[PDB]
Paper text:
One fibril morphology, termed hereafter morphology I, was relatively abundant in our samples and associated with a relatively small width of 7.4 ± 0.4 nm and a short cross-over distance of 41.5 ± 2.3 nm. Implementing this symmetry, we reconstructed the three-dimensional (3D) map of the fibril at 4.4 Å resolution based on the 0.143 Fourier shell correlation (FSC) criterion. The fibril consists of two stacks of peptide. The cross-sectional layers of the fibril contain two Aβ(1–40) molecules that fill the entire density, demonstrating the absence of major disordered regions. Each peptide stack contains four cross-β sheets, termed here β1–β4, that extend between residues 2–8, 10–13, 15–19 and 32–34. The β-sheets are uniformly parallel with respect to the orientation of the hydrogen-bonded β-strands relative to one another. The β-sheet twist is right-handed, whereby the direction of the twist is defined by looking along the main fibril axis. The central contact site, which occurs close to the fibril main axis, is formed by residues 24–26. The two equal contact sites at outer radial position involve cross-stack heterotypic zippers between sheets β3 and β4. The stacks are offset from one another by ~2.41 Å, corresponding to the fibril pseudo 21-screw symmetry.
Author numbering:
A (entry chain L), B (entry chain K), C (entry chain J), D (entry chain B), E (entry chain H), F (entry chain I), ...: 1 to 40
Amino acid sequence: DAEFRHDSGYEVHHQKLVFFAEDVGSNKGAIIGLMVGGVV
Amino acid sequence: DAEFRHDSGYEVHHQKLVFFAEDVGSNKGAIIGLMVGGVV
Amino acid sequence: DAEFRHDSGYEVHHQKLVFFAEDVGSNKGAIIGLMVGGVV
Amino acid sequence: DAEFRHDSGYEVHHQKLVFFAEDVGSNKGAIIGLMVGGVV
Amino acid sequence: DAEFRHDSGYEVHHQKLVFFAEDVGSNKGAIIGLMVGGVV
Amino acid sequence: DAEFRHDSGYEVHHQKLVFFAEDVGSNKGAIIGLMVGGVV
Amino acid sequence: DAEFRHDSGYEVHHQKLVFFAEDVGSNKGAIIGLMVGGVV
Amino acid sequence: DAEFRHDSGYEVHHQKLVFFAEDVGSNKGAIIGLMVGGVV
Amino acid sequence: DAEFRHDSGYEVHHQKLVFFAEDVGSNKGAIIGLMVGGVV
Amino acid sequence: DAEFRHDSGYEVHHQKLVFFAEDVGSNKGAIIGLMVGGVV
Amino acid sequence: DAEFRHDSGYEVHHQKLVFFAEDVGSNKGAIIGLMVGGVV
Amino acid sequence: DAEFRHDSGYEVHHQKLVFFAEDVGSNKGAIIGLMVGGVV
């Protein structure tokens, strides 16, 4: 879920950088050992 | 869940940088060992 | 959950930097060993 | 949960910096060993 | 939970800096060993 | 839980700085070893 | 680079857990923009 | 590079778990833009 | 770089847990923008 | 760089726990914008 | 850089806990904006 | 940089706890904006 925009007019550089990001690692869930339980 | 915008008009540099981010590590869940319990 | 905006008009530099962020580490959950308990 | 805005008109520098952030470390949960207890 | 705004008109510098933040360390929870107790 | 605003009109400097923050260290919870007790 | 051993003789439980690990996140390198420099 | 061993004799449980691991994320290298530099 | 050993003889429990770890987050390197400099 | 050992003879419990660790957060490097400087 | 040892003979409990650790937060480096300077 | 040892012979308890640690927060470096200066 994301929307990215790059818009420019008159831009002068030698060295310009732009960077976006959200996530690089896990988010949920690795293991379960159980006998009773409701979960999502 | 994110919305990013870069908009510019008259910009002059030698070296310009822009950077966004939210997350790099885990968020939830690594392990469970249980006998009784309701969870999410 | 985030909304980021960069908007500019007349900007002059040699060296300009902008940076945003929220999170880099864990948020919840590493382990449980239990016999009785309701949890979320 | 966050909303960030950068808006400018007439800005002159050699060196300008802007930085935001909320979190870099954990927030909750590392371990539990128990026999009886309700938790969240 | 946060809302950040940077808005400016006529600004002149050589060196200008702005910085916000809330948190860098833990907030809650490292360990428990118990026999009886209700917790959150 | 926070709301930050930076708004300016006619500002002239060589060197201007602004900084906000709330927290850098822990807030609660490191360990418990108990036999009987209700807690939060 | 690792060596793990689990060796046991007479062991009695209902619930026994063992866990090892080293790394879950990055170690090095995300980006570079440069004009002059020796690096590794 | 790893060596793992599980060896057991007389073991009694209802629920026993064993887990090893080293790595789940990147280790090196994402991008470079340069004009001069020795690297590895 | 690690060496882990679990060795036991006569052990009696209901609930026994063992856990090791070194690292979960980054170690080095996120970005550079430079004009002159030797680095590692 | 680490060496961990668990060795035991005659041990009796209901609930025994052991835990080691070194690191969970970053160690070095987030960003640089410079014009002249030697670094490591 | 660490060496951990747990060795025991005749040990009797209901509830025994052992815990080691060194670090959970950052160690060095968040940002730099400079024009001249040697650094490490 | 650390060396930890736990060694015991004849030990009797109901509830015994041992805990070591060095660091939980930052050590160095958050930001710099400068025009001239040698640093480490």
